[PDB]
C-alpha cells in the first residue's frame, strides 16, 4: 500500500501507523486527507518527521486538490483534498 | 502585502481578497494557515484557482512545517503550517 489515509481517530493512530510502514522496509508513504482532515494530515507528517525520526525524512511532494461530492439530494459540492509524500532522507 | 493570513472568517473572505490582489494587480500571491485553519487555506487556493480564475492560475509552492507555542503556563507546544504561493499562468 504505502498510503495513510487520514480519518477522524486521534493524529497518534495515523503517525504510527505512517512510522510502521517506514519501519518496516518502505522507503516512500503517502499522507492522504480531504476536508478538515488536511490539517490532521499535515500534523501527522510534521510529528513524524520532527518528534520520532528528527533529520531522517524528507517531504518528496505535497499536492492538494478537489474531490466531486453528490449529497443524498443529489446536489454536488467539492471537498479539498491533499496529498504528502514523504521518505527516508 | 501579497500574503492572505487565513483567519477564523468564513472562507468567501479569505478568497475575496485573494481574487482581489490578483485582479488588482499583484502576479504571486501567498496564502498561510496554521493548525486547523490549514484545511481553510487549502478551500481558500482551490475556490480560488478551480472556480474564478479558470486555468488561469497555478500552484508555484506549497510548504508545510512546524512553529512553537509557548502561550500560556509557558508548557510550550507545535503547531503545523502551510504555506501556498500561486499566481496566474
Known amino acids: ?7 477522524k481517530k486521534p493524529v497518534m493512530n ?10 518496516q522496509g ?3 508513504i ?6 478538515r482532515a488536511i490539517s490532521k494530515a499535515v ?9 520520532f525520526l528528527p533529520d ?3 517531504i518528496k511532494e505535497i499536492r492538494v ?3 466531486v461530492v453528490t449529497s443524498q439530494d443529489g446536489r454536488q459540492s ?12
Do not use: H, P
Not at 500500500?1 to 480519518?7: A, P
Not at 503517502?30 to 476536508?35: D, F, L, Q, S
Open 14 to 23: 495515523y503517525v504510527l501507523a505512517a512510522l510502521t510502514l517506514l519501519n
Open 56 to 58: 531522517k525524512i524528507e
Open 30 to 35: 503517502v499522507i492522504k486527507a480531504r476536508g
Open 43 to 51: 500534523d501527522t507528517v510534521e510529528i513524524v518527521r520532527n518528534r
Open 65 to 67: 486538490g478537489s474531490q
Open 78 to 89: 467539492r471537498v479539498s483534498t491533499i496529498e504528502i509524500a514523504i521518505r527516508k532522507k
Open 1 to 7: 500500500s504505502n498510503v495513510v489515509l487520514i480519518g
Open 26 to 28: 518502505v522507503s516512500e
